[PDB]
């Protein structure tokens, strides 16, 4: 049980430096555990980045560095880029075995940024087979926290909804975020009024996207 | 044009066991150990083991005795790994990858990976997704943009493909995370955003594809 940790979350902005940092539960990270570096980019996409410590691998940006740092082994990003957000691996030899950490999700900051919101009421086709989903788009947005509150006849809703959240765009850096309402092609038929409230940093009042079913 | 693709994946029952496969080109397979690692839904990279050109040497995890087998056929350019007594903690993307070693620089790397395999261990059926337009309106716009998109409700297990028009059209898309309703059964959400006056310019199909269960579904998106 050698166990590798590395810190788990780190924001920096465009052109700053960042440090990632590796360590070991047996001892002191050394030249002899051949520290490597992974990046993971959305779509399990995979780059070899460091080796054996400090050797940048062939076509690897100047940027990325490895060195040690104290007790554990180190990524450093010198003037971080918008397309830097990422995943990061560090692994360690450990004589036979290799070992990796648990990974640091690097996000990269921007200027706030809105969502703009969407709401879909469910098709018709879905509405044939007896149940009957909302969905709620927030697009584009920055910083990631949001948010949603469903409202059916103006009721708060509560235990009938899930959301998800795509990565970091390596582009323009936002966030979006697509959550859906769940209910039974009954109760759906049993009211008007469907409503997506968002609340977010770029927002100064709550934006509500509605629909009334049948118009 | 390194190229490393695998298969072998899908649905397995508990207990049982499962053959990957993972053919190469584009590189002098003889000479390079190969290496294999795994990734759990959520969860962080696991290495599983690794071999030498010649077979003589193969490095695992510490494991239980013959959990993974690795072996290798060079005739072939082909890398494989046997999995035996699965259980749901088996559940994962199986990554093929070539190991760049170097003994003079002291370098040992994992520079080029395959995309993945996926194995799910469960007993659960097998279902295919139900593919449901989400309808744009020239009335509903956002910031400039209108929105449409595809859910894909209800299907197990993981993954779903989808693309648009094809793999046409690219910009301005989101395929979202799947989440796992308390009904046992996943749910996803692929969006496409365009400039409102865009609208009525283009075709929009949503393509989605469910291995497992041999689903293949063309959705046209109509404004509505």
Redesign the interface.
Same mark, same amino acid.
């Given at each position: 049980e050698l166990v590798v940790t590395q810190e788990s979350a780190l924001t920096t902005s465009p052109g700053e430096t960042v440090t990632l940092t590796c360590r070991s539960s047996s001892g002191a990270v050394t &030249?002899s555990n051949?520290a490597?570096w $992974?990046q993971?980019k959305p779509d399990?996409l995979?780059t !070899?980045l @460091? /080796? /054996?410590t400090n *050797?940048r691998?062939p076509g690897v940006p100047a940027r990325f560095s490895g060195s040690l740092i104290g007790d554990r082994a180190a990524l450093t990003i010198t003037g971080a880029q918008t397309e830097d957000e990422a995943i990061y691996?560090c +692994?360690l030899?450990n004589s036979?075995?290799? $070992?990796? !950490? !648990? !990974?640091t999700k690097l996000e990269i900051k921007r200027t706030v940024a +809105?969502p703009? $919101?969407? @709401?879909?009421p469910?098709?018709d %086709? #879905?509405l044939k087979?007896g149940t009957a989903?909302v $969905?709620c788009?927030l697009?584009?947005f920055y910083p990631r926290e949001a948010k949603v509150q469903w409202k059916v006849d103006n009721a708060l809703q509560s235990g009938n909804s #899930? %959301?998800?959240? &795509?990565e970091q765009d390596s582009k323009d850096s936002t966030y979006?975020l697509?959550s859906?309402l769940?209910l039974s092609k009954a109760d759906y038929e049993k009211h008007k009024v469907y409503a997506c409230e968002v609340t977010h940093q770029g927002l100064s009042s709550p934006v509500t *996207?509605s629909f009334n079913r049948g118009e | 044009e390194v190229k490393l693709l695998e298969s072998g994946g899908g649905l397995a029952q508990p207990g049982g066991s499962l053959k990957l496969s993972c053919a190469a080109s584009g590189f002098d397979f003889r000479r390079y150990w190969m290496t294999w690692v795994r990734q759990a839904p959520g969860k962080g990279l696991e290495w599983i083991g690794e071999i030498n050109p010649d077979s003589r040497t193969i490095n695992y995890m510490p494991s239980l005795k013959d959990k993974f087998i690795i072996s290798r056929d060079n005739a072939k350019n082909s890398l494989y790994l046997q999995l035996s007594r699965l259980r749901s903690e088996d559940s994962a993307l199986y990554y093929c990858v070539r190991l760049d070693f170097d003994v003079y620089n002291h370098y040992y790397v994992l520079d080029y990976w395959g995309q993945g395999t996926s194995v799910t261990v469960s007993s659960a059926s097998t279902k295919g997704p139900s593919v449901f337009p989400l309808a744009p309106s020239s009335k509903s716009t956002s910031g400039g943009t209108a929105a449409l998109g595809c859910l894909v409700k209800d299907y197990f297990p993981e993954p779903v493909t989808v693309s648009w028009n094809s793999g046409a059209l690219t910009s301005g898309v989101h395929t979202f995370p799947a989440v796992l309703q308390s009904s046992g059964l996943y749910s996803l959400s692929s969006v496409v955003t365009v400039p409102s006056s865009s609208l009525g310019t283009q075709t929009y199909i949503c393509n989605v594809n469910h291995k497992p269960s041999n689903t293949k579904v063309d959705k046209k998106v109509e404004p509505k």
């Amino acid at each position: 049980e050698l166990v590798v940790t590395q810190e788990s979350a780190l924001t920096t902005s465009p052109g700053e430096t960042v440090t990632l940092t590796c360590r070991s539960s047996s001892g002191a990270v050394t &030249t002899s555990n051949y520290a490597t570096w $992974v990046q993971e980019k959305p779509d399990h996409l995979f780059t !070899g980045l @460091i /080796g /054996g410590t400090n *050797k940048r691998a062939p076509g690897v940006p100047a940027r990325f560095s490895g060195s040690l740092i104290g007790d554990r082994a180190a990524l450093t990003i010198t003037g971080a880029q918008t397309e830097d957000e990422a995943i990061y691996f560090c +692994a360690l030899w450990n004589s036979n075995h290799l $070992v990796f !950490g !648990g !990974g640091t999700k690097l996000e990269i900051k921007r200027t706030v940024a +809105a969502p703009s $919101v969407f @709401i879909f009421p469910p098709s018709d %086709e #879905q509405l044939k087979s007896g149940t009957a989903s909302v $969905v709620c788009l927030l697009n584009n947005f920055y910083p990631r926290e949001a948010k949603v509150q469903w409202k059916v006849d103006n009721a708060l809703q509560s235990g009938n909804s #899930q %959301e998800s959240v &795509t990565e970091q765009d390596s582009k323009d850096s936002t966030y979006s975020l697509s959550s859906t309402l769940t209910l039974s092609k009954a109760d759906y038929e049993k009211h008007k009024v469907y409503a997506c409230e968002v609340t977010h940093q770029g927002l100064s009042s709550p934006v509500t *996207k509605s629909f009334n079913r049948g118009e | 044009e390194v190229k490393l693709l695998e298969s072998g994946g899908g649905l397995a029952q508990p207990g049982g066991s499962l053959k990957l496969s993972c053919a190469a080109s584009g590189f002098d397979f003889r000479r390079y150990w190969m290496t294999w690692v795994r990734q759990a839904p959520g969860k962080g990279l696991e290495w599983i083991g690794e071999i030498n050109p010649d077979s003589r040497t193969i490095n695992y995890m510490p494991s239980l005795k013959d959990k993974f087998i690795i072996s290798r056929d060079n005739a072939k350019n082909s890398l494989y790994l046997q999995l035996s007594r699965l259980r749901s903690e088996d559940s994962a993307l199986y990554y093929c990858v070539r190991l760049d070693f170097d003994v003079y620089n002291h370098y040992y790397v994992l520079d080029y990976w395959g995309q993945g395999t996926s194995v799910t261990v469960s007993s659960a059926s097998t279902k295919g997704p139900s593919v449901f337009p989400l309808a744009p309106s020239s009335k509903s716009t956002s910031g400039g943009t209108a929105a449409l998109g595809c859910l894909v409700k209800d299907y197990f297990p993981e993954p779903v493909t989808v693309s648009w028009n094809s793999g046409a059209l690219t910009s301005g898309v989101h395929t979202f995370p799947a989440v796992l309703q308390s009904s046992g059964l996943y749910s996803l959400s692929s969006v496409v955003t365009v400039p409102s006056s865009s609208l009525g310019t283009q075709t929009y199909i949503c393509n989605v594809n469910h291995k497992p269960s041999n689903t293949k579904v063309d959705k046209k998106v109509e404004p509505k």
